Write a protein that binds this ligand. Structure first.
Ligand SMILES: [Zn+2]
Ligand SMILES: [Zn+2]
Lengths: 42, 68, 67, 228, 146, 105, 709, 165
C-alpha cells in the first residue's frame, strides 16, 4: 500500500473490520479510513 | 680509506699523487680535470683512482683509542 | 643479459661515466633528469673517443683485432 | 583456463565456476528460428511483460491483477499465451501459497483471489508482492543467459551458462546429436561412464593447447582412465 | 601514434554525445574498453615492424632475436620504438581514486595517456605517470613469482 | 562549475528575504529566526546594495556578511515564552523560515 | 648568474630535510609521548582509593623524566656507546611527585624514583641532541647514523611503523555470495568493539555484535535510540523519489511482527538479547540494561545522554548500505591508502605504559591494605618507603616487551608478535632503509591477492620500487622522502569553528533534509549539513593558510556519497605541494632567491601561504601539475619534485626511468646486501657480525637524493 | 537605499521553541491549523517536555479499538527533550526595525505514546553513582506539577523590549 497515518506518522495495516469489510487501520492511534486502495508502480 | 698504491687495471703507481692533488685543489685553485691532468695521469683509467675516492682514515683517526 | 632484462639505463651509466672521468666531474644520474645523453657524447667525442663508447680492442691471447 | 581450471577437473567438484554448454542449431537465418531457440531458454521474463503489479481491495476480496501486453511477445519471439501464463503461475513456486485459484479475463489479467498473529491478510499481500516479480514464466531456471554467435564461417551457434544438458538437449530447434559442456559430472549424469572419459581427455587437452605445452596425449588418456 | 590517439578520442567525445553503436556481446562500457584496447594493441605491432625493417644489421639485439639465444622482437621494439599499454588483470588499469586513476588527470578521463598506455620507449625515458603505470604491471608480474 | 551556483542561487535567497522583510513590514504578530555567529565583537544591519546582495555591516566596524537558509521548516515551528515554572505557553507563532549569518574572512 | 624557477624549485627539498629529518616519524612520536601523553596518563589515574577507609588517598601531582631541581637534565647518564659494550640498556629514571596525608590532615610532598624508562637515541632526553662534531667523537658515537632506535640489554631494537584500518570511521565491503557487510571499528580506550552490519537475504537488515545474542533488525534498534516516527524512518534513509524506497520498506513491515511501539516494548527487546549479563546490580534488566548498551559501554565512542546523533549515526550508516544494494559500485576498497592509518612508536609505548601503570596501582593496593589493617595504630611512614620493591616490574616488563617483541595487553586484546626487530647493520643504507619501513599485518595467507599489487593511490606517499623479494612481497612497504605522519591536535575547536562558518546543528534541522547539498562529517560524525559547501570549503582552506595549524586538519567533498569531510584525527601521511592561484604558481622567483640566501626557510612557506600539505583522500579534490610548463587555469596544485616518489634505498639507481620496474625492485634487495663502510666508529664498536670494505669508492654518476642521505 | 537596524534589545527572560515534527502544512488557505485545547504540563531538571493534542471524536475515530484495548481516551501525549545551543536568535519586525530576542533553548516534539505505557503497567499482574545516562534516565518522573494554563498575548512581549532605548 505504502500509506502513512496523518495523525501519528506511523505504518498502517489493512484489517478486516468485524468480519466482512476491508478498511485500513493501525494499532498506533485510533484511526480508520475505508477507501479502496491501489499499488500501481512502473 | 687510504689511496691505493697501484691502480687496479694496469698497475701504475698512483699512491704518490694524492697529497699533491689536495695541494693543487686548495691553493692554486683549478678545476679537478685540469689539476688532475697537469699531475701525471693521462688515461681515464688511473684517473678514476684520484677522482672517485673517499678519505675515511681522517674520519677514523678522530676515534683514537690512545691517550688524546 | 640486456635484451631479456631491458636495463638500457645501465648503458647510460657508462657513457655518462666514461665522459665523467675525463673532465674531472662526477656526473648526475638522477631520476626524471640528470645528464642528457646528447651533451655527454659531445664531451666524449672531442677527447678522441667514440660518441657511443664502442672502443676497438686488440685481443689478448692472439694479438689480432676483434671483428 | 589456468591452474585453477585443472584443479576444477581433478578435484571432481560438485558445482564448478563458470560452466558453459555448446548447443548448436539446424538452419541458418536471422529470422524467427535462430531467435526463437534463444527465447525458449532464459527465465524470469515477468519483470518485462507486466508494467506493474498492483493489489486492490474490493470490500471482501482482493485482486493482484497483472497487465500482460502483446508487444513484448512481438519483439522477442516466444510461444506463450495468457493461458500458458496462467499455467506458469499455477506452478510458479513449489509450496508457498499457490494452490487455489487463478483467473483469465479477456484483456489478459490474472488476479489471485485469496482467503484467510491477527490480520494476516496484509502480511501475505506484502510477501506475495515481494515474491512475485522474480517468478519464471517460460524458460529454464538453471541457465543464466544465452549468446548466439557467428564462427569463422557463416554459421550460427548459441551458448548458455547453465547446468541441465537434458532440458537444453530436448529443445525444439536444436539438434541433440553433438553438444559439449565443461562440467564433467553433468556429462556423467546424462551420458555415462565412457562418455565422461572421452570428455575429460579433450577437456584437459583444451586447457593446455591454448597455451602451448604438448603433453603427448597418452599421458592425458592415462589420467582420464584412473579417475573413472 | 597521433593517428591512433585521434581515432580513439573521437569515441570518448561520442560517448557523451548520446550513445554509440554497442556491439551485442556486452554493454556500452565494455565495448569501449575492447575497441580502445584493440587500437592501442594494433599501434604497438606496426610501429614495431617499421623499426625492425629499418634496423641496421651486425648489431647485437637483432642477431640475438634472429637466432634463439635470448630476447624477442617485442623486446627490441619495446626498447627502440615504443613501450605500449601496460595491462593489469587482463584489462587496462582501474581507477585508483574515485572516477580517475591519477590526480594529474581530470575526472572522467579515458584517454590513452591517462589510463595506462605509455608512449615513451626505454631509450628516451618515462614520465612519472608512465613510470607508475609501468611499476604497477611490473610489481604484479613480480608478485606472481613470490 | 560549482561557482555558478555560488552566484545563481545567492540571487535567489537575497530576493526571498527581501520578499519577507519589507513586503510584510506593517504589523504581523509573527516571528522569524536568525543565526548569528558567536565571539561577537564587544548595531549595524542589512544595507541593501545597488539591486545586488544583502550583507550586514555590524557595529565594531569589522564586517559580517550572510543571508539565506534552508527549507528545513516544512514542519511546524512555533516559539513560546516561559516564566519561573508557573506560567508558560504564551506563544507568538510562525517561523517564516530562517536566515544564517556567516563572517567573511 | 640568474635564478630560474623550474631549477631552484629543487632547493625546496633540502630545506625540507634540514629542519625535520627523514627519521622524524620515530623522533616526533617519542618527543610527543614524554612531553604530552606521559602527563595525560596520570591525569586519568590521579587518585587511588582503599577499602579500609575512605579517608586515604594518594595524589599524583606531576610526572617527569630525569628532572628535580635547577641543575641540568640528569647531569650523568650512561653514554649510549658504553651501554652497548656492557650489555646494558639506555634508560632514564621516571620521577613522580605524590601527596602524602594522614587523618591529622598534614600535607607535604617528596620526590621518588618509580622506575626506569628506555631512552630513544637523539630525541630531547639523550646526550646526542644537536651535539657538536667534537662532542660526537668524544663520546664514541658516529655523527651520521639515523638514530631513532632503542638499545636494550646491549642489543639494538627498532619499533616498526605499522598500518591498520581507519579507526572511528566507516568502511563498506561487498559480497555476491552471502551479502554486503559494513563495519565501524570503535577506538575506545577501555574496550575494543567492532559493530558489524551484515545482511542475509531480501534486505532483512540486522546488525550484529560480539556482545549481543540472536540479533535485532535495525528498525527496532534505531527506534529504541530515539527515531520514533515511521515517517522519518522512510525518508531519512531513502530520499524523495529514489529507487531506495522499495528496498528498505521490508524492515518497516516486519517492525510490526516484533516489539514495535516505542520504548515500553522496543528497548526491552534490544536489552533482553544481551551477552555478559553483569550479575552485579542485575535487577535493572527492564530499562537499564540497554541504556548501558546504547551508551559509552558499547558500540561506539559517543557520550550523549539523549540520542539524536547516535540514532542518526546508525541510521546514516544504513543509507550507505541501501545505496550499495541498488548500485554495487558504491562500496569501499580495503587497500586504499585513505582507509589506512599508520601507528608509530609513540603510541605502543603509551599503551604499554598505561597497562603497566594500571598494574602498578593494583599490585601496590594489595600490599598496602595488608599492612594498614594488622596493627592498631595508623602507620605514619613506610607507605612511601615500600614502593621500591613494586617499581621493578614496571622496569623489567617495559624492557622485556621491547627486547622480546611481544606487546601483551590483557585488557585491550590486540596481542601482536614481532613488533620490535633487531637493527640491520649490513651497510649504511641497511640501517637507514629499516628506519623508514612499514610492516602490514595480514589476516590470513590463503587467498589474499589484494594487498600486494601496487595501488595508484600511493603516488609519492610510499616507495613504489622497494619491496622485498620473498614471503613478504608487497606486505612490507617504505615511506618516501617528503612525507609526514600527523597527530591529532585538539578536535574540539574545529567543531565550534564550523558553527561560526554557518552550519546548523543537528538538533535543529528537520529529519527530512538531505535532498539539499552536502553534509559535514567531522571524523565520521555528522554535524548538520551546511548549504553551499563550495564556499564552506573555500573559506575553510583560506582559514587553513593563516594558521589553523595545518598538519592534518583537512577538508574534502564527496559527490557519490553526498557528503563533505573535515578530518582532524592524525596518524596519517601527507605530502607538501605548491599552491597555484587560478593562472600560475604562488612561489615566485623572489621567494627562491631568499631561500638560499639566509632567512625564509621551510615553515616560513607554510605561514605565508606558499606550500601546503595534502592528504591521500584530500588530493582527490585536487588536480596537480607535474612541471611548470603545464599551468592550466583549472588547476589547484603544483608538485615540488617528480622524483620524490622513489625512496631512500631506491634512490641509488642511476636513471630508473630507463630501466624496467622489476630491475628497480631487485636492486632494492641487492643494495642493502652490498658490503662496505658502516660508520666512523666501526673500528671502535663490537657486535656479532659486520662486513667491511678495504678501499671503498664513491659512485661515478650520482643522484640528487644520495647527497641528502 | 536604507537599512533596517537590528539590536539585541536586552536579555532578561527565557525562551523555548516547539518545532513540531508531525504537522507540515495545509497547502492552501492559511496553512498548518495550530490547535487550541492542549494545556499540558512541563518538567525542569531533565527538561522532559510533554504536550497534548485532542482527538477528533466525530470522524475516523474507530471507537472499538479505542475503548476495547485501552481506556476511553481524548489525550495524545507528546514528548521532547531540549538541548542548549548558541548563536540562535528570534526576531520580529515593526515598520523600520528588527528586534533580536535570545532564544536560549531549542527542542523537538516527538509523539511518544503514553497510553501503551498505561496499559502495560496495568496488565502486568491483571546505587548512589550511575556515571551518566542512567541517573539522567532515572531522574525523569518526580515533580511534574506544572499542569499549565495555555495563554496568549502581544502586550507582555512586544511592549516589553521596545522601551529599552
Ligand atoms: Zn495518523
Ligand atoms: Zn690504468
Amino acid at each position: 500500500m505504502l500509506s502513512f497515518c496523518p495523525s501519528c506518522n506511523n505504518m498502517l495495516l489493512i484489517t478486516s473490520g468485524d468480519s466482512g469489510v476491508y478498511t485500513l487501520a493501525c494499532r498506533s492511534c485510533p484511526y480508520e479510513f475505508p477507501i479502496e486502495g491501489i499499488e500501481i508502480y512502473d | 680509506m687510504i689511496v691505493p698504491v697501484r691502480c687496479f687495471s694496469c698497475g701504475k703507481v698512483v699512491g704518490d699523487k694524492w697529497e699533491s692533488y689536495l695541494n693543487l685543489l686548495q691553493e692554486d685553485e683549478l678545476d679537478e680535470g685540469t689539476a688532475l691532468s697537469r699531475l701525471g695521469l693521462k688515461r681515464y683509467c688511473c684517473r678514476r683512482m684520484i677522482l672517485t675516492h673517499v678519505d675515511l682514515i681522517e674520519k677514523f683517526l678522530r676515534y683514537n683509542p690512545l691517550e688524546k | 643479459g640486456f635484451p631479456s632484462r631491458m636495463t638500457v639505463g645501465k648503458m647510460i651509466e657508462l657513457i655518462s661515466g666514461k665522459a665523467g672521468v675525463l673532465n674531472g666531474t662526477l656526473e648526475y644520474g638522477t631520476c626524471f633528469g640528470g645528464s642528457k645523453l646528447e651533451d655527454m657524447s659531445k664531451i666524449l667525442v672531442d677527447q678522441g673517443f667514440n660518441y657511443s663508447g664502442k672502443d676497438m680492442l686488440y685481443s689478448g691471447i692472439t694479438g689480432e683485432c676483434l671483428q | 583456463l589456468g591452474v585453477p581450471r585443472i584443479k576444477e577437473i581433478i578435484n571432481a567438484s560438485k558445482v564448478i565456476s563458470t560452466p558453459i554448454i555448446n548447443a548448436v542449431l539446424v538452419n541458418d537465418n536471422d529470422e524467427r528460428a535462430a531467435r526463437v531457440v534463444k527465447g525458449r531458454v532464459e527465465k524470469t521474463l515477468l519483470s518485462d511483460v507486466a508494467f506493474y503489479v498492483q493489489d486492490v481491495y474490493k470490500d471482501n476480496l482482493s485482486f493482484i491483477q497483472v497487465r500482460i501486453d502483446l508487444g513484448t511477445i512481438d519483439k522477442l519471439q516466444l510461444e506463450l499465451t495468457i493461458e500458458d501464463i496462467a499455467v506458469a503461475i499455477t506452478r510458479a513456486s513449489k509450496l508457498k501459497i499457490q494452490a487455489s485459484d487463478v483467473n483469465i479475463i479477456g484483456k489478459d489479467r490474472i488476479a489471485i483471489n485469496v482467503f484467510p498473529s491477527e490480520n494476516d491478510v496484509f502480511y501475505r499481500m506484502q510477501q506475495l508482492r515481494r515474491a512475485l516479480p522474480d517468478v519464471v514464466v517460460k524458460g529454464l531456471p538453471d541457465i543464466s543467459r544465452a549468446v548466439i554467435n557467428i564462427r569463422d564461417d557463416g554459421k550460427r551457434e548459441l551458448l548458455v551458462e547453465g547446468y541441465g544438458l537434458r532440458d537444453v538437449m530436448c529443445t525444439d530447434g536444436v539438434i541433440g546429436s553433438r553438444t559439449t559442456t565443461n562440467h564433467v559430472l553433468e556429462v556423467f549424469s546424462v551420458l555415462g561412464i565412457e562418455a565422461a572419459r572421452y570428455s575429460i581427455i579433450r577437456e584437459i587437452n583444451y586447457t593446455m593447447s591454448n597455451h602451448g605445452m604438448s603433453v603427448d596425449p597418452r599421458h592425458i588418456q592415462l589420467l582420464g582412465d584412473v579417475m573413472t | 601514434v597521433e593517428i591512433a590517439y585521434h581515432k580513439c578520442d573521437e569515441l570518448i567525445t561520442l560517448f557523451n554525445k548520446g550513445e554509440l553503436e554497442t556491439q551485442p556481446g556486452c554493454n556500452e562500457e565494455q565495448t569501449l574498453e575492447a575497441k580502445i584496447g584493440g587500437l592501442l594493441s594494433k599501434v604497438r605491432e606496426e610501429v614495431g615492424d617499421v623499426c625492425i625493417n629499418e634496423l641496421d644489421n651486425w648489431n647485437a639485439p637483432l642477431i640475438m632475436a634472429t637466432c634463439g639465444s635470448k630476447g624477442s622482437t617485442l623486446n627490441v621494439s619495446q626498447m627502440v620504438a615504443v613501450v605500449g599499454q601496460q595491462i593489469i588483470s587482463g584489462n587496462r588499469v582501474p581507477d585508483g581514486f574515485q572516477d580517475r586513476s591519477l590526480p594529474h588527470f581530470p575526472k572522467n578521463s579515458k584517454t590513452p595517456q591517462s589510463k595506462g598506455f605509455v608512449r615513451n620507449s626505454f631509450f628516451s625515458g618515462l614520465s612519472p605517470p608512465e613510470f607508475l603505470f609501468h611499476a604497477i604491471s611490473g610489481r604484479e608480474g613480480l608478485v606472481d613469482t613470490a | 562549475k560549482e561557482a555558478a551556483a555560488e552566484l545563481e542561487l545567492l540571487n535567489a535567497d537575497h530576493q526571498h528575504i527581501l520578499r519577507k522583510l519589507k513586503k510584510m513590514n506593517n504589523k504581523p504578530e509573527r516571528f522569524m529566526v536568525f543565526q548569528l555567529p558567536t565571539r561577537l565583537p564587544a548595531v549595524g544591519s542589512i544595507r541593501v546594495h545597488k539591486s545586488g546582495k544583502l550583507s550586514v555591516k555590524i557595529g565594531n566596524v569589522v564586517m559580517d556578511i550572510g543571508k539565506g537558509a534552508e527549507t528545513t521548516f516544512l514542519q511546524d515551528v512555533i516559539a513560546l515564552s516561559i516564566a519561573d515554572d508557573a506560567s508558560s505557553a504564551e506563544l507568538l507563532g510562525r517561523v517564516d523560515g530562517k536566515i544564517v549569518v556567516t563572517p567573511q574572512i | 648568474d640568474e635564478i630560474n624557477t623550474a631549477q631552484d624549485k629543487w632547493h625546496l627539498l633540502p630545506a625540507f630535510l634540514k629542519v625535520k629529518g627523514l627519521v622524524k616519524q620515530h623522533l616526533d612520536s617519542f618527543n610527543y609521548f614524554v612531553d604530552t601523553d606521559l602527563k595525560k596518563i596520570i591525569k586519568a589515574n590521579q587518585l587511588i582509593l582503599s577499602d579500609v577507609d575512605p579517608e586515604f588517598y594518594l595524589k599524583y601531582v606531576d610526572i617527569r623524566v630525569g628532572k628535580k631541581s635547577s641543575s641540568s637534565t640528569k647531569d650523568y647518564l650512561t653514554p649510549p656507546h658504553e651501554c652497548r659494550l656492557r650489555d646494558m640498556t639506555y634508560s632514564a629514571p621516571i620521577y613522580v611527585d605524590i601527596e602524602y596525608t594522614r587523618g591529622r590532615n598534614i600535607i607535604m610532598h617528596k620526590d621518588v624514583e618509580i622506575g626506569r624508562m628506555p631512552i630513544m637515541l637523539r630525541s630531547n632526553k639523550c646526550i646526542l641532541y644537536d651535539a657538536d662534531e667534537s662532542k660526537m667523537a668524544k663520546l664514541n658515537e658516529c655523527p651520521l647514523d639515523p638514530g631513532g632506535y632503542f638499545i636494550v640489554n646491549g642489543t639494538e631494537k627498532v619499533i616498526l611503523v605499522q598500518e591498520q584500518l581507519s579507526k572511528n570511521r566507516i568502511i563498506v565491503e561487498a559480497d555476491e555470495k552471502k551479502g554486503i557487510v559494513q563495519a565501524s571499528v570503535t577506538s575506545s580506550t577501555h574496550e575494543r568493539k567492532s559493530k558489524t552490519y551484515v545482511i542475509t537475504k531480501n534486505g532483512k537488515i540486522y546488525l550484529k555484535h560480539n556482545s549481543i545474542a540472536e540479533e535485532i533488525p535495525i528498525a527496532i534498534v534505531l527506534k529504541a535510540c530515539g527515531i520514533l516516527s515511521d515517517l522519518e524512518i522512510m525518508q531519512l534513509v531513502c530520499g524523495n523519489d529514489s529507487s531506495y524506497q522499495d528496498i528498505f520498506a521490508v524492515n518497516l513491515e516486519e517492525s510490526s511482527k516484533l516489539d514495535i511501539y516505542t520504548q515500553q516494548q522496543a528497548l526491552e527487546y534490544i536489552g533482553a538479547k544481551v551477552k555478559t549479563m553483569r550479575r552485579q546490580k542485575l535487577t535493572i534488566l527492564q530499562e537499564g540494561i540497554e541504556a548501558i548498551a546504547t551508551t559509552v559501554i558499547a558500540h561506539l565512542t559517543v557520550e550523549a545522554l539523549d540520542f539524536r546523533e547516535k540514532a542518526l549515526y546508525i541510521a546514516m550508516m544504513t543509507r550507505r548500505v541501501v545505496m550499495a544494494m541498488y548500485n554495487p559500485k558504491m562500496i569501499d576498497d580495503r587497500d586504499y591508502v585513505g582507509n589506512k592509518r599508520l601507528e608509530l612508536a609513540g603510541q605502543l609505548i603509551s599503551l604499554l605504559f598505561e597497562d603497566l601503570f594500571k598494574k602498578f596501582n593494583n599490585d601496590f593496593k594489595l600490599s598496602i591494605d595488608k599492612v594498614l589493617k594488622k596493627p592498631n595504630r595508623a602507620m605514619e611512614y613506610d607507605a612511601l618507603l615500600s614502593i621500591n620493591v613494586h617499581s621493578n616490574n614496571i622496569t623489567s616488563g617495559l624492557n622485556r616487551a621491547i627486547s622480546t617483541g611481544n606487546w601483551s595487553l590483557k585488557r585491550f586484546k590486540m596481542e601482536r608478535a614481532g613488533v620490535t626487530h633487531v637493527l640491520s647493520r649490513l651497510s649504511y643504507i641497511s640501517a637507514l632503509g629499516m628506519m623508514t619501513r612499514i610492516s602490514s599485518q595480514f589476516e590470513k595467507s590463503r587467498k589474499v591477492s589484494g594487498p600486494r599489487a601496487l595501488q595508484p593511490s600511493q603516488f609519492g606517499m610510499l616507495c613504489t620500487a622497494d619491496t622485498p623479494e620473498g614471503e613478504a612481497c608487497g606486505l612490507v612497504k617504505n615511506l618516501a622522502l617528503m612525507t609526514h605522519i600527523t597527530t591529532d591536535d585538539e578536535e574540539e575547536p574545529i567543531k565550534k569553528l564550523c558553527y561560526v562558518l554557518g552550519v546548523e546543528d543537528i538538533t535543529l534541522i528537520d529529519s527530512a533534509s538531505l535532498h539539499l547539498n552536502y553534509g559535514v562529517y567531522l571524523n565520521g560524525t555528522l554535524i548538520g549539513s551546511i548549504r553551499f559547501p563550495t564556499k564552506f570549503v573555500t573559506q575553510f582552506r583560506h582559514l587553513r593558510r593563516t594558521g589553523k595549524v595545518s598538519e592534518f586538519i583537512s577538508i574534502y567533498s564527496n559527490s557519490h556519497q553526498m557528503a563533505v569531510h573535515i578530518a582532524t584525527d592524525g596518524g596519517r601521511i601527507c605530502r607538501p605541494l605548491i599552491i597555484v592561484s587560478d593562472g600560475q604558481s604562488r612561489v615566485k622567483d623572489i621567494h627562491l632567491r631568499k631561500l638560499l640566501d639566509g632567512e625564509l626557510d621551510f615553515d616560513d612557506f607554510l605561514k605565508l601561504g606558499l606550500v601546503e600539505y595534502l592528504d591521500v583522500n584530500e588530493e582527490n579534490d585536487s588536480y596537480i601539475a607535474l612541471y611548470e610548463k603545464d599551468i592550466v587555469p583549472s588547476m589547484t596544485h603544483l608538485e615540488i619534485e617528480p622524483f620524490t616518489i622513489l625512496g631512500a634505498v631506491a634512490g641509488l639507481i642511476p636513471y630508473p626511468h630507463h630501466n624496467q620496474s622489476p630491475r628497480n625492485t631487485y636492486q632494492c634487495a641487492m643494495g642493502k646486501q652490498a658490503i662496505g663502510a658502516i660508520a666512523y666508529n666501526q673500528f671502535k664498536r663490537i657486535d656479532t657480525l659486520l662486513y667491511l670494505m678495504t678501499y671503498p669508492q664513491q659512485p661515478m654518476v650520482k643522484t640528487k637524493t644520495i647527497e641528502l642521505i | 537605499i536604507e537599512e533596517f537596524p537590528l539590536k539585541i534589545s536586552g536579555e532578561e527572560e527565557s525562551l523555548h521553541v516547539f518545532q513540531y515534527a508531525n504537522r507540515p502544512r495545509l497547502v492552501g488557505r492559511k496553512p498548518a491549523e495550530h490547535p487550541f485545547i492542549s494545556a499540558a504540563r512541563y518538567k525542569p531538571k531533565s527538561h522532559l517536555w510533554e504536550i497534548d493534542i485532542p482527538l477528533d471524536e466525530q470522524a475516523f475515530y474507530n471507537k472499538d479499538k479505542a475503548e476495547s484495548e485501552w481506556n476511553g481516551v481524548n489525550v495524545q501525549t507528546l514528548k521532547g527533550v531540549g538541548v542548549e545551543n548558541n548563536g540562535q536568535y528570534a526576531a520580529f519586525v515593526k515598520d523600520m526595525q528588527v528586534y533580536l530576542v535570545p532564544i536560549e533553548r531549542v527542542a523537538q516534539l516527538k509523539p511518544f505514546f503514553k497510553y501503551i505505557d498505561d496499559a502495560n503497567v496495568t496488565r502486568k499482574q491483571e546505587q548512589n553513582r550511575l556515571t551518566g545516562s542512567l541517573l539522567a534516565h532515572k531522574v525523569a518522573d518526580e515533580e511534574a506539577n506544572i499542569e499549565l494554563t495555555w495563554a496568549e498575548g502581544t502586550f507582555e512581549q512586544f511592549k516589553d523590549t521596545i522601551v529599552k532605548e
